[PDB]
Structure 1
Amino acid sequence: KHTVEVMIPEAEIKARIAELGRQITERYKDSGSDMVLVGLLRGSFMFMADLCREVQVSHEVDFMTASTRDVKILKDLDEDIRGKDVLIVEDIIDSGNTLSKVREILSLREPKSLAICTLLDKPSRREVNVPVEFIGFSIPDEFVVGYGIDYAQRYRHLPYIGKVIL
C-alpha cells in the first residue's frame, strides 16, 4: 500500500543524458577503434535507448543479463569486445557488487578500454569500491522506480524517476 512521488522529472533526465552524451563523445571520439555500449537488462533498456542516441561516435549496442550468491551470466553479449572500447550502461549503482563482477568478467576478454556509465549512483549504499567514470545523478538512498526500474514488476515504463512511499 504505497504512492509514487516524482523524484527526478523527465525534463531533468533528458538534460542530464544530453550532457553525459557530450562527455562520452569527447572521451571516445579520438579512439578510431570499434566501440560498444553494453546494457545490463532488464533495468538499463530505457537509459541505453536515450544515451546511445546522445553518443556522437559510431558504436555497436549489445546487452547482458547478470544475476550471498555468485554473479552468473544469464545471457552473454552477441558480439566480441576484444580490442574494442566498451562502455557498460547501468540504471543504478548501489552496493557496486554486481557491476564490479560484470566489470571483471568483460575485462578477461581484453577490451582496448573498459568503463561504466550509470544513471543513478547510491554512494551511501556502496559495499565495494568500483570505478564508475560517468554518473547521471548521485541520489540519497530512496526507493526509486520508473525509467526501467521496477517495484515488484511495476513502473518500468514511467518516463521519470519516482520514489516509492509506504
Structure 2
Amino acid sequence: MKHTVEVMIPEAEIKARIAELGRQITERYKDSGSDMVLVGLLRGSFMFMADLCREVQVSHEVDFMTASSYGTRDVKILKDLDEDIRGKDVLIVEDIIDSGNTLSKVREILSLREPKSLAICTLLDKPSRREVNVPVEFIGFSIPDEFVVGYGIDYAQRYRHLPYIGKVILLD
C-alpha cells in the first residue's frame, strides 16, 4: 500500500561502520591457525557480504546458504553450503536479526558439522522484537522497530539495490 522511503542510515555511515566491523573481525581471527569462511544468508545479505569481506583483512573463504525461516514453520535448507566448515572459522553474515528464530536454527545446523569456531555478524539488529536469546558477536547497528529497506533488505522484492538503509512510512 501507498508508502514512502525515508533515509535512516546514510551510505557514508554504513561504509564507516562496516570499515570498523571488518576492523573488528580481522584481529579476532588474525592468528587462528585454521581456515576461515564467511557464510552469508541469501537473499538479502549479498551486499553486506560483498562490502564486509573487502574489509576483512584475513585470508578466508566466502560461501552462501538459503534457509527458510521459522517465523511457526520448520527451518529448511533450500540451498546448502558448497564447501565444508568442519574445523574452520565460520562467521555467519546476516542482514537483520529481529526474532532470532531463524538464526538460532541456522547456527544449530552449522554447529552439527563441528566447526572450530562459530560466530554471527549482523548489519542491523532489532532487540525490540527479540524472541529467542541468541548470542551475536558482531552487530553493525541496533535499530528501532521500523520496517527497513535497502542494502539487500526488500519490501515486496523492491528497494534491494539501495545503497542506504531507509524506513517505510505508510501514507495515512
Bucket of the pairwise TM-score, normalised by the shorter protein: over 0.9
Please state whether the residue corresponding to 2:85 is helix, strand or coil: coil
- Name 1:123's counterpart in structure 2: 127
Distance 1:96 1:71 in 2: 12
Aligned Cα root-mean-square deviation (Å): 0.8
Q: Which residue of 2 aligns with 1:149?
A: 153
- Count of aligned pairs between the two proteins: 165
Match of 2:28, SS state, is helix
Question: Counterparts of 2:157 and 2:114 in 1: how far apart (Å)?
Answer: 35
Name which of structure 1's ranges 134-143 and 60-69 shifts more when overlaid on structure 2: 60-69
Name the CA distance, whole Å, in 2 between partners of 1:125 and 1:13: 22
Question: In 2, Cα distance between the equivalents of 1:163 and 1:41?
Answer: 21
Q: Distance in 1 between matches of 2:44 and 2:33?
A: 30
* Cα deviation code 1:42-81 (max 9, x no counterpart): 0110000000000000001000000910000000000000
Quote the offset at 1:32 in angstroms.
2.1
Instruction: Summarize deviations over 1:66-110 as a string: whole Å, max 9, x none.
Output: 091000000000000000010000000000000000000000000
Whole-Å separation in 1 of the counterparts to 2:6 and 2:130: 25
Secondary structure at 2:23's aligned position in 1?
helix
Q: CA deviation at 1:118?
A: 0.2
Moved over 3 A (4+): none
Residues 7-43 of structure 1: CA distance to partner in whole angstroms, max 9, x if unpaired? 0000000000000001100100110200000000001
18-27 or 59-68, which moves further after superposition? 59-68
Q: Secondary structure at the match of 1:136?
A: strand
Tell me how far apart the structure 2 counterparts of residues 48 and 81 of structure 1 sit (CA, whole Å).
Answer: 18
Quote the residue 1:93 is aligned against.
97
> Which residue of 2 is the match for residue 53 of structure 1?
54
Q: Say which is worse superposed, 65-74 or 153-162, in terms of deviation.
A: 65-74
SS at match of 1:56: coil
Q: Percent identity?
A: 99
Q: Distance in 1 between matches of 2:168 and 2:149?
A: 7
Determine helix, strand or coil for the equivalent of 2:13.
Answer: helix
Q: 2:162 is paired with a residue of what secondary structure?
A: coil
Q: Under a length normalisation based on structure 2, what TM-score does the superposition of the two structures give?
A: 0.95
| Alpha-carbon distance in 2 for matches of 1:103, 1:43 | 18
TM-score (norm 1): 0.98
Shift of 1:111: 0.3
